[PDB]
Amino acid sequence: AFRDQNILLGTTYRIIANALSSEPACLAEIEEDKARRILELSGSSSEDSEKVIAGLYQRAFQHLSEAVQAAEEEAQPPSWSCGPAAGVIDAYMTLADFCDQQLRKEEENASVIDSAELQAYPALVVEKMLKALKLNSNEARLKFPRLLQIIERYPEETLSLMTKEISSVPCWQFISWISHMVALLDKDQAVAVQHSVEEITDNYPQAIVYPFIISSESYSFKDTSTGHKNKEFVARIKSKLDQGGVIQDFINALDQLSNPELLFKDWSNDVRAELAKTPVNKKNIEKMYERMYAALGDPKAPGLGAFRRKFIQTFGKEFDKHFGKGGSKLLRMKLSDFNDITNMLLLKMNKDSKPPGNLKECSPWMSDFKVEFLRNELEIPGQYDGRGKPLPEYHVRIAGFDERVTVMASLRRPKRIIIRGHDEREHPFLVKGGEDLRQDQRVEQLFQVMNGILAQDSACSQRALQLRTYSVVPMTSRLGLIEWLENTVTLKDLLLNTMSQEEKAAYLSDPRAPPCEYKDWLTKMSGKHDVGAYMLMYKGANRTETVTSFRKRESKVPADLLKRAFVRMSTSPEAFLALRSHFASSHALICISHWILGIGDRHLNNFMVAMETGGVIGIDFGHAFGSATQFLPVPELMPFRLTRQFINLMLPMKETGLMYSIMVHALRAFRSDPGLLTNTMDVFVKEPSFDWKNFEQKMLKKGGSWIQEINVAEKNWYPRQKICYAKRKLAGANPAVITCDELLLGHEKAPAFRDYVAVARGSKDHNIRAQEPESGLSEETQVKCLMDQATDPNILGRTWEGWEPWM
Amino acid sequence: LVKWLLAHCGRPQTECRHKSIELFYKFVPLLPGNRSPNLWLKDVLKEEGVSFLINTFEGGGCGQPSGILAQPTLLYLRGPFSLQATLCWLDLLLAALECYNTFIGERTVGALQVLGTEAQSSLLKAVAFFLESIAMHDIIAAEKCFGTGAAGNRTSPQEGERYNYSKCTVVVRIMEFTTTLLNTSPEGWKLLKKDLCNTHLMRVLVQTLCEPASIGFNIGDVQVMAHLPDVCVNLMKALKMSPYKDILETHLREKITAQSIEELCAVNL
Amino acid sequence: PMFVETQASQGPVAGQIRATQQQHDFTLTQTQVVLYRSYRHGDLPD
């Protein structure tokens, strides 16, 4: 009871101090008696606002430390359950969060007067966080990268402490964050995690093998006394993980499924970027050429299949007639001739690709996969979740691969394999080669955190609001697996399969269709036939013209298309009602979550609909934290997709019904306690693999709406503004203001920046997002502004044509 | 196809190995050469060393470097104790024993050209280790050699019975293989004196003769208790026609005598 | 998914089915030109 009293008193003092620090003038808005009471409780005498705030923070810290001290006395039950450990974990996490928010607000202001006060805070945070994690705390488990980044800024206070304290934590508490631990094995603070990494390697090698393979191709050990030790530790871990090379040949077999004419294109792109940035480098160019020719030039490959064997037999002589038998001619080659050579090669390669449909003629290893005797047992990747203690004996092991391979009809041509496990069931996966799937994995982890947050809110738990997630398992920097969603089709396919023959023919071929009429209108409003059409239309066309044009263009699309799609797949009215309700709920949740995370590339092919439940599933997370509004040549000004079909599906109801309530509840749940989500997003945006260089190649591998390679010569990649805008969104900022800030950060020198912000901000006559303040908005006002901005015809009439705002 | 069948003869799968041997012996005499299996195997053992046939017999069919050739004794399994890992080694030893007994027993090869050469062989070491360490004791004998520290606990009756069945099959296979070596090669008794027939084989034979239940042969089953006396008397008739008669007589007399029968049947009420 | 035809490495009337014959090159386990005909009554669904 004393511990709980101390905890509550420290919490009250912290709340008072935060209220005073957020509004220093609010002290005068209270009665002089209550203000005098606050001044007496603060213990200060200077009557200064900062003095009162510091006194209240000191009182809160004293009470929290006393509570923790009381919790560390005569509380050691042998059977640590969720009952007795509740208060201890509560005190630990309360003190840790207090000191952590103090350190965070100190790391934001350059002028630091709170120096002697915030001295023992890093070590206290580390110790209390680790002691709570030892007690199996989920809140402490989800904030481990906070310690990983604290020990980097304050090494001399927390390095040895964490090194000696983490040695008593179960190794399976770090499976969720193994990719961060294996990524800093070459840094100076590597010693703090070496024990846990080795324990995981000894106990659960399958849960560390893929992250270690991903991290091992970027290690840059220095030539110091500690660098050699780190390199020796990494070498020992690699020798202990290479049990029988089964993982290596499995990765090679999965890589045999990728189209070689796309790996060649990616290699050409990266060597092109290497051949123009700096004065031509010999070692890097020859290394890239060697790594390329090792897989596409040598017919004597270990696991070569007929698919890639034909490509090698047909294009191995060109790699000698144009390149210098290892890169000699390529090194002395000029960028202008290299472009023509690569274009001719890509033409003559894409002229005949013909991806096979049988596993025996594309990857022999998976075709004759046989469980050997007394050999290492392979395991279906993506089964080690850091939630609790894993049971490897229940994990499904690979027993064979199906012979049928389905190739998708997209740009990158991904392959769908069916892995037969020892559990006598099939597990389909999507094999995407030549693409970094780490960002998608981190986005899925953010979605898991959001689902955990929504599961604790009463208003969301009573409605079962959960984002549909799937397992993304990256194996290398150019290969990964994605869980295949069974019996699901994209939203664009669902809309197109609902149109009749005449309707589909009119939408696709008639010159009065929206796809062609929109380009004709862009030409008549700009005079150009290229991307500059939008740049000139934002300046030329006014609001009324584009609004009338968009309202006329919408009329040529069937209104109840999604409603007909839902009544065609249902038999009873109960089924249709359930399908429509589930679709609306899932779409609202996806919209609000993607606005919180800043997902922008939400066209019709990035939404999948389950043909058995009607729910919506989001995929293809390439843009995050306003990346689509900041770096695209045609900026996307909508927060999410709320086009005419979604509105007509709910008729005769309005948008202020189910979707509005779901969005309001989800936003309130996200803004209630945003500390965990903010910490996770800050860990996301500070990853070294999420720089501008990776975004460059990520956009180059698609080429959907991005301008080109050498258009954006500067970086302009602000890692702090992303989390700042995220915190502003979670604090109650106006969506239009955030959009204008992203536009100012991205397109500042563009000739249509003023028109961009004028369209994104709206007018006080028709759209209610400018009739509201720029901050302090409630959840309901924020959702109203979001629905006003996402359904604004002035914004939809200027959207990129591939986004299809009319449907 | 016959090359694949030959290469997949030493696999631990019992029924699959039997079918692979039967199909081999049925498909060889109808090759384009139209000759006996002995002539074909002799003509194929020339273009490549007999080490090929040795690695085919001992090395597993499924996994090439996974037979008893890569682990002659049970002391090479680095993992902890597990009945599934003991029975797999037992099945590998059984697959090697059956391959040897079928090839040498059908005059396809010579008993001295495949087991008395200078190439690496792990059959004799394996059978000697089995006869000296496992063939006499219960599952504890196989448990005391898988990380001897921190031995296990009591085992379920099924876990014990499957191990006993495997061991009783392996000992019968060893007896049949020795009877084949004796009945086929009159001078092949030399190489089996080093570690195969000194004392362990005679001891387990005189134990199976007197008390079969002490090895693990379950009594309540007629499908094997009507075949065990046959192989026993065949091995004894093969030993009585060999220089090993003296040691057999000594062990048999020290195991059973007339005075033993007298003291056993003295009181019968 | 359905099986896809294997890619090549490089490079007598309608409604007339075979008739039921008796010549069998394999002898039944005791425990020639092809003749055609037309569809009878009970061959296809009515």
Ligand SMILES: Nc1ncnc2c1ncn2[C@@H]1O[C@H](COP(=O)(O)OP(=O)(O)OP(=O)(O)O)[C@@H](O)[C@H]1O
């Ligand atoms: N997790 C998944 N489960 C099932 N099908 C999927 C999954 N991910 C993608 N697909 C299907 O594969 C197609 C292509 O996959 P991918 O996401 O790589 O394409 P993309 O490059 O985004 O193409 P586009 O943007 O034109 O749709 C999708 O349109 C969808 O039909």
Ligand SMILES: [Mg+2]
């Ligand atoms: Mg997509």
